[PDB]
């Protein structure tokens, strides 16, 4: 939610970090 | 405000997050 999503997106970002890593 | 600051920074991240897709 508006509060959890902030933190949740942080876990998603991890995946985003996992993505950049493809480069990396 | 962490709530607004993080969610806000995310907006800034979104853009960065967008670039990664175009890595590529």
Swiss-Prot record, chains A, B:
Gene Ontology CC terms: extracellular region
Residues the record lists as Arginine amide modifications: 24
GO biological process, alphabetically ordered: defense response to bacterium
Subcellular location: Secreted
Keywords for the protein's UniProt record, in alphabetical order: Amidation, Amphibian defense peptide, Antibiotic, Antimicrobial, Disulfide bond, Secreted
Main localization of the protein described in the UniProt heading: secreted
Tissue: Expressed by the skin glands.
Quaternary organization: Homodimer; disulfide-linked.
Role according to the record: Antimicrobial peptide. Active against Gram-negative bacteria E.coli ATCC 25922 (MIC=1.5 uM) and P.aeruginosa ATTC 27853 (MIC=23.2 uM) and against Gram-positive bacterium S.aureus ATCC 29313 (MIC=11.6 uM). Has no hemolytic activity. Associates with and disrupts membranes in vitro.
Name under which the protein is recorded: Homotarsinin
């Amino acid at each position: 939610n508006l509060v959890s999503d902030i933190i949740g997106s942080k876990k998603h970002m991890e995946k985003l970090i996992s993505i950049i890593k493809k480069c990396r």
